[PDB]
Amino acid sequence: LNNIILNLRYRDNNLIDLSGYGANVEVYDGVELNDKNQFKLTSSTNSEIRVTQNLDFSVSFWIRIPKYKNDGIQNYIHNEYTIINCIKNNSGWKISIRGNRIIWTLTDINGKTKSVFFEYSIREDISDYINRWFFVTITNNSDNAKIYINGKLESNIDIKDIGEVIANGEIIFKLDGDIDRTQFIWMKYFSIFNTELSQSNIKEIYKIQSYSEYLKDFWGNPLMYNKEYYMFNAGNKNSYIKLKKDSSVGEILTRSKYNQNSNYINYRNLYIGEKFIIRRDDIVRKEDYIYLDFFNSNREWRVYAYKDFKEEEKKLFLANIYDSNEFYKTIQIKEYDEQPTYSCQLLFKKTDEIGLIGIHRFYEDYKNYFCISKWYLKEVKRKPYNPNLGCNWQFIPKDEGWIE
């Protein structure tokens, strides 16, 4: 898969063509860049990238699209805006977004237009897509233009009506349309191929570009130390952790949802439960030894596991930071899943294995509690790794792309 004509990648604090065809790439001052290959497009005049290139072609990239402002839903749903435009003599292609939709458009020499789109729901309790890094691939031959999302075919339309399409036009990365000053788009790994990629090729590219040295947060950004995170359980999506009133255990409650009338939108709240923080660059990696802490009022507390553990599962101990011979404190963060994910696991060790952190039904009538469990130790070795297991967790920081 060297069939790449443009490969925009980070190098020496700049975005450049690493294809070997050496396209001229101009990044303007208003674009934000990091060494993790992310670049942000804002509403500012000088937030653009300009590419001067040197029917059977493909375009791949990742994207993180901000959640709708609850008060401005109508603009969101109506107002379309271009993010990438490649035109010459009024002919070429453009990638545009209209609310919860991403749109691919081809225009021929005679101004003839056909479009294909992907629409993600804005009524889901927990969305895989909203404000989260996901993978987009767009293939084109003589017959069909189709969109693949995270390696899976989603959309497909016939284009045999369309005449000649001049696709060697200058590529402008820029927000264009009826946009709020607040509007932004994150993108990474923008590539053009001179062939229709197969589904097999795209699953392989998705899995390659899914890998990183470091663990990731809920949004698909790198998991950090000394950073405040709400906690998400992949096995119990609609649950969260709350400290039991004036006690030392973590009870599991159901997330609240959107309250206002507007029946265009539904979601569960993410900024609910205790604000956790991971203790020992400030980047969290596989097999790292950590302390899992949280803030109780304005004092930093800790998640401990009781060393007297004859039962298969037991409630975790939430208390002030204090060394006790009765309690395990050292957790090792794990990534058992071989397939793409933002989930990690939490393993208490002494070097034996005591149990994994999860959620379980304890009797008192029954109730759900934040627990260690020996059960998970066997399940994580089974293949394929089950992504809906209770021992799979995700960290949600505050993000300007998600206001609730």
Add this chain to the structure above:
Amino acid sequence: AFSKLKEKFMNELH
């Protein structure tokens, strides 16, 4: 303070 929390933890374990 830690003691008073550990007891409450023991009460929950019951």
